[PDB]
Amino acid sequence: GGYVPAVVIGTGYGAAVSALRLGEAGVQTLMLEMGQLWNQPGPDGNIFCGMLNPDKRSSWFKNRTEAPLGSFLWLDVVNRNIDPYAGVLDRVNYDQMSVYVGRGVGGGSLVNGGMAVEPKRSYFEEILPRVDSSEMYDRYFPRANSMLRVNHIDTKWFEDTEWYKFARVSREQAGKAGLGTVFVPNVYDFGYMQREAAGEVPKSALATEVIYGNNHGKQSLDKTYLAAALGTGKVTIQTLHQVKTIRQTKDGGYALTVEQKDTDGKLLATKEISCRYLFLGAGSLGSTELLVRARDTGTLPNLNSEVGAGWGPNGNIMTARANHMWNPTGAHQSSIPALGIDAWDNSDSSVFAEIAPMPAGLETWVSLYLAITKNPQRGTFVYDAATDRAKLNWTRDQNAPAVNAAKALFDRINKANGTIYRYDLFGTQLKAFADDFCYHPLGGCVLGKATDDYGRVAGYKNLYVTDGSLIPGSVGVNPFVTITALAERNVERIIKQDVTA
Ligand SMILES: Cc1cc2nc3c(=O)[nH]c(=O)nc-3n(C[C@H](O)[C@H](O)[C@H](O)COP(=O)(O)OP(=O)(O)OC[C@H]3O[C@@H](n4cnc5c(N)ncnc54)[C@H](O)[C@@H]3O)c2cc1C
């Protein structure tokens, strides 16, 4: 342990942006990540497990693998008992909500679908009226786009390849309902994907990999921002180090208690690490838990009442349509979405939907969708001193507005095509809409609420939040581009106004 000028907690999008710009500014920075650096070939020779061969690497400290949501009827047959291990995907279970997050150097960038989408400007202006939207769209969205290595599918290759038949089927069905589709930019390299389909490079997206990591193709943050941060010479990353408490001492700045564990979860050491500037990039769940705990255990007692508040799941809802026999979606489905349905107009009926692949590897006739909706309901994280956890108080009825909007859109598609929903994909009770999961947790430490308009935590100096906990519950699109661009904005201002090299 010891002192380092800047500490960044976590290594997801907010953290990675912050560490790069700190290091470029000459500020010696230590990143603390609770998960692994994913660079050691495993027993199959690969870093990551695929969706048809899950093992302990798939899961953060669970004793059994799980099928990706939507796929249980086909993928339960590959599930196995596993040792609890520091694997890459954590399903965090709350009372009535399961939030999925990445664990490792790169955070959710390791496990996500790569979809890189800028929000609608008029919606950005609605959710964050205190922010100057011209500087976001003129400067920080472009900077994020370039640094993340966003790229665009070859639309002619898209049209021709078997691997996107599933997307084409939903496009034609939507089209009968008078709905067009949009191509979705991605950080998975689409040139690599063409080499995969040609047999020239190892398959990853085209071998049912994404949610437990991609062994190839996906430009996760370890390849982009974090590689650049290490390249500054001013940034180091310590792994299997979980920050537990944050306090003030006579040294000035902040002092952390940090548990070092092995990959089996055994406690090896508790370290004291301290800093002048402290940046929280532990995600919506992790940053909020740290600050709720610090407030309610009295280590940072002047934190305000908005710490913990304002959480939402980005309106996330999953649903599925049963195609007729003559409209198969194909046995070969790229694991990386390329198409969406943009029915988002900022009204309460708004939906932005991903046309999601089914990883079964054989024909199912299912079209799967992940809808993003506009639902004003919010939850709060409440400290439980008995277990030393933040607990999210969300109830399943709070997703009714999200379900309603999703269903109105997909009812229009079903009606135009003579199809019905599947009701059997999400457990044994009949349920067409999965309404108790989240891939896109947003809020808990909302920008301008718990913090100033640049993520400076209210009540404290040189204490910053950088990540999805800043966003007010919803962005109307897949969120990592927004998180990245906001982080670019915030750290540039913080370095200029607050920091010394
Ligand atoms: C299955 C899935 C699919 C998704 N698909 C998309 C997509 O296609 N496009 C999109 O835009 N978004 C997608 N997302 C969401 C996106 O990945 C997240 O919005 C984004 O990763 C959030 O970034 P963040 O910086 O807030 O936190 P995270 O990326 O979650 O990173 C937080 C990091 O902090 C670490 N950490 C947490 N607590 C501590 C602690 N106390 N001490 C040390 N380290 C800690 C974590 O282990 C993690 O590495 C998806 C996510 C999932 C799970």
Overall radius of gyration? 22 Å
Structural class: alpha/beta
Strand content: 15-25%
From the 3D structure, determine the CATH topology of the largest domain.
Answer: FAD/NAD(P)-binding domain
Assembly type: monomer
Write down the CATH class of the largest domain: Alpha Beta
Q: How many E strands?
A: 21
- Please describe the biggest sheet, giving its number of strands, its sense, and whether it closes into a barrel: 7 strands, antiparallel
Query: Which word captures the global form?
Result: globular
CATH architecture of the largest domain: 3-Layer(bba) Sandwich
The overall number of domains is: 2
- The total count of helices amounts to 11
Ligands in the model, by name, code or SMILES, are: flavin-adenine dinucleotide
CATH 4th-level superfamily of the largest domain:
FAD/NAD(P)-binding domain
Terminal residue distance: 21 Å
Helix content: 10-25%
